[PDB]
Amino acid sequence: RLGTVSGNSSLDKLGLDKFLSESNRAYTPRAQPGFSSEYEQIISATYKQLFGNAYIMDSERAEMAKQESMFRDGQLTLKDFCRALAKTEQYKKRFFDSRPLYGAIELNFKNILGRTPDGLEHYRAKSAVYDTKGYEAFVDAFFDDGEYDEVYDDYTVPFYRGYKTEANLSMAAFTHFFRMVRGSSTSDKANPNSMQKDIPLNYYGITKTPLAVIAPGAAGTAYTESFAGTGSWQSGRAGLNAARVALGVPATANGKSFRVEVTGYTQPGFGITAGTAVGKLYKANKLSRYPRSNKSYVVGFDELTPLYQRITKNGGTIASITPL
Amino acid sequence: AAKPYESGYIAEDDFWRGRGIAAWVYATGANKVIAQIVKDFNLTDKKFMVFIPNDGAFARLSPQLRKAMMEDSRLVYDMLAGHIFTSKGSAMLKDLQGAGYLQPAYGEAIGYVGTGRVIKIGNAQVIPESSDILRKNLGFSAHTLDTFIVPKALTKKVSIEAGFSPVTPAKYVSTTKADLRYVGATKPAAVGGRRAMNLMKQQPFWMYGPPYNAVTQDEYEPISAAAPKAFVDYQIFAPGTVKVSPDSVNANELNPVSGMSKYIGKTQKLVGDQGISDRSDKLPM
Amino acid sequence: MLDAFAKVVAQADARGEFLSNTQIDALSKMVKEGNQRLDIVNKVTSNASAIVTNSARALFAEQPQLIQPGGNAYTSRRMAACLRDMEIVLRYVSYAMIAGDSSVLDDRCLNGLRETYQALGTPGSSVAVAIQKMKDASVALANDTTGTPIGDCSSLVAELAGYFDRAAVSVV
């Protein structure tokens, strides 16, 4: 299901349907000797949250069999178990040793705290712990600042809260949450913007610029774009992504400006003819008609309905429209 | 051909009609093939063993497989030759124990697993309630299966993506007077006349309220604008002929404590019915 | 785009198979309807202006806030663009009826229509009421005789109703 109408709900059909249905709350201080089925569900729930729905095989799950047993009588699950599992080699291999420091820093904000870094000062406060004391205190600052005991009971599993309004964040952090959590059938190895090696919010998390939210399972759900500078000072290059500003005379002539994102551009299907063109298939210089798929446009309002037909009749898929 | 009860059921062609476990071999022409198989592999002298699938095994046979047994008569040949076994001869069920292999008539050494009373021949299971029948003359053993012995080397040519993926046609469910109303809105308003507003349906009773103000159908009529200059005098009639009648002689039905009155004031439009009308009675004028 | 004949060919090329004998016999039935499909496309297209206008007339009778000042259909440019969209959806539903496949319908009309109405503020629950009013004006126009020979077309009117329901859930 997609949309906002027809159910009087917007967030469950924005990718959060499984996450809006669980508690996983560990209602007793120690596991009862004799039974394993209730506490196996809580350990599988804190694996799915803290590792971001990654696959832990049985040869890797046996490497954390010690902590699992300290939790069953003599440790909390929020503190002291998520903290113990974050110091393991399985967490460290895929969330810390693979990325730069600011890439590992926002994966810990998602996995431990359930949100995104707001600005540069959320990044900068956590890199200072690593520079002076190492990794072992770096993962404690996510647990031992004020935010963690405030928002979570110390016997529940963490949950995602970066979209909510009681997590007192900026509104650019709402758009950033739906870049890092794309539905319930996804991990951060299965994310096209961070593939367990990248920094997912690099320019955008620092400068706090908002992004257009594309729902998971939409038509143009496969839209991704690169990053490039544009100016002479930073030695940038023109003509890769469309701008996000609409500055001049073209901003308000032809009405209010919009920013349209197209996804799928192929060589078959350009003309007005229902079929491919047979023959040479490529001009001399051997380039495609669209050298990149995933193009973007900045268009006025009086030019929006001719552009809409120019996209879809040539094979493109509209991913997002956003008024500038 | 003839009746099976003639010559008792002592005839070999009529005995399997009598022991009615495999009725599909005579309903189809499958019994011509197994008579032609034992011609073709000379099994009439030496003892052997057949595993006939029963009725129900032919019924649970898949529609992507039963089509491929009709368009390929070679595939019907070796599937029926895959049930005739010449390894152990006339073997009973107690000699089918353990794990091992079996040589078919045409096909190739199909493995069996026989564990006590449950005996599998490889995607098949011998029902042991009726399976130890031995014929003395032309001697074999016959056991009963619940599924066909289908080797996987035959049926890589079959699939469900050929067109045997089952699909049901979904129906619409409109009622006959439900539209006869709706055909008058398809005409343009110069020729459809009043009937051009036929597509509006019955709103709930609060939708005609003063926040929302849904327009009733009767406005689109001229019966809302019946505002004449002329008037009946009502005093020129005979006394007793002017009749009037109230809606209810009650203070509490004409007006409740709230303003939701069906009779007094501007809340007479808030009825759950009376949103649409019958103006498909007249004409397209 | 690709119709219903091209739909099963593309499903069979990706498996690398010839078409079955059962699959040819199922495409003979699609040619056997043939003329009954072209009667529905003839009746819907021939009354296309009256279906759009009289189901816009009935929408503003039940939701009269859309044409009040501050409503989404109040001005001449904003009313003429509303009738233009209701004719766009009826066009691509008739395109999907002659083809037997809803592929031109979503690749050229529906994909990006929900994103457009969310950037403009157009009420998506009122667009689906206008879609559902063109539906029963057209499935009641489908099963009337009016110069057609008598027969059963109840399987092709369930297909036409399913294209109106598809356009209505892609905007609501």
Next chain:
Amino acid sequence: MKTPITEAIATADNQGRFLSNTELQAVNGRYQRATASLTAAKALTGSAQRLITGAAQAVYNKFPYTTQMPGPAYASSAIGKAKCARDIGYYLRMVTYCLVVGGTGPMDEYLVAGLEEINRSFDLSPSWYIEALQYIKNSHGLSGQVANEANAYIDYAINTLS
């Protein structure tokens, strides 16, 4: 994909209008010819292996150097022979797809777009595939307008190869 159905939709959607009787007749003529085309496709499917083994042998008889010369391009080894009976089955399957659809659409999208680029690169000769197609035109055993529909798409592929 080019089809009598989809070319009627595409010529009305380009003009931005509803399907008139200009377009309802182009798909009426697809339905009249569909009975001849569907019997031509059921017969070419059921005799495909005879036509595939025969047409490959018909190329080795006209051009016997293709079973002699060393190299990867030629059908000398058993690997180059298996990649040739696969190429004939591709050309034959696209003909039965074009009969089912009703136009030269499936062999445009899947076979003849980019065909002169993959022949010149892998050093295949288009004269090998013409003689493989002249065999099928002479050996399908069809008659009348059933053979008129089959030979119309066989003759279409010979024009692109030549």
Next chain:
Amino acid sequence: MKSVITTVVSAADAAGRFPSNSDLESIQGNIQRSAARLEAAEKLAGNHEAVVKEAGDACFAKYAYLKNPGEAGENQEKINKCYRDVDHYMRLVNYCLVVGGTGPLDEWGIAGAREVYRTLNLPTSAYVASIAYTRDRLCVPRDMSAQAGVEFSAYLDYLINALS
């Protein structure tokens, strides 16, 4: 919606398992109980305009102060929105007998209601007096059957305990 199906599916999704033998045993309870609660949902859907309007003025027969100046039943619009908001609640009880749980009442009628009826100053004991009147108006052999009235009243005082 909170239902019988959606409870046992979500419980076996958080555990990450297939539908067990105890998850099919719950849907059998949805079969043997559907006869009573669909009789109540059909009796209500046919006579709803007379049930709503009988309960809408049972609010104003107990609380005649709502027509005073500044109150919530001053003018014609405010009683149109009041009879609407009662008809909204009776539609959601019709939706709860169909689904089989308190799903549509929770997500659409109860959640967020305390913050709206206090901001707009609608007395929540008068969104109750209409619901409590309908629960005692029901004659158990006359309108519906015995077990159809058990299901009808049990969704009627779930709403009362959620507004109180």
Next chain:
Amino acid sequence: MKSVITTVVSAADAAGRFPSNSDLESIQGNIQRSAARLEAAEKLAGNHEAVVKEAGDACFAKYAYLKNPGEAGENQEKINKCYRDVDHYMRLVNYCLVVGGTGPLDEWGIAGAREVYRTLNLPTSAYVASIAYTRDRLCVPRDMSAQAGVEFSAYLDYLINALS
């Protein structure tokens, strides 16, 4: 201990709500389906000494190599522990019938089994091959009633998918 009662009490606790009408309906399905499985468990009770003996011979018949020196069935003492370990699995499915769900299998027979069997060098396919025998010698109108065989088979396949 997954049952029908335990699943709805734990789901009402996870949302902090009282037992609703969606929860008592699931207990109704426990009442209807009870007479099916409670006489299958009565059938398994008085006739367990012969069912495990028949199932015990059906794995050494399939895997006759277990009696080799150096395997898991060398002497009579290691043979006696296999008829014991299959009598436990027939007691734990006798518990699953009277509970109403896959509780007692998930705790005492399945959880921890695939690391006990791997370490102690026991082939799980032979703990399978005796469970799939009593699934196959069961014909539904002779051994029990028509609905008791549906429940008795439903737990044996649950044990088979757990080992396999």
Next chain:
Amino acid sequence: MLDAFSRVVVNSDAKAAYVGGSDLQALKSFIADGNKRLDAVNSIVSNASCMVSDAVSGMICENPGLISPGGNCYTNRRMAACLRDGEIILRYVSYALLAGDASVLEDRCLNGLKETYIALGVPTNSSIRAVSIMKAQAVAFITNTATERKMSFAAGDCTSLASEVASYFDRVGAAIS
């Protein structure tokens, strides 16, 4: 996530309509044919381990380049994840068969599965064939046409349930395409 009964409720709520009369008969039919649906969901989850292993093996036997260096299912970590990618997809289809609506399959599984499979690099043609093999297994156990197992049922026809679950599997191939 909606079941069959709550699907007609969100359709009635869009037009302020009560549920009764015409719509209650299509839901009373759901209860009357409801014993078949539990009797068919049991047939799939009883064989749910053999169904998944046979689907990933049969995907490999037809396309044996997947287990080469460069194939997606090469190592043991990749083969065990592909055996688990399909065990979850079968689990959500059995939820939609129990509910009678495809909303739990689209909300929790298919929304985002496409861009899952383009970040990892999973071949969509091979994953569609693994679903297609599971479709043939699900119709065979529902209609009792399995050549390797013979489940006991009461006598009757369940073609509408098999054509229902076949439409759930085709949503998996249309999403990730």
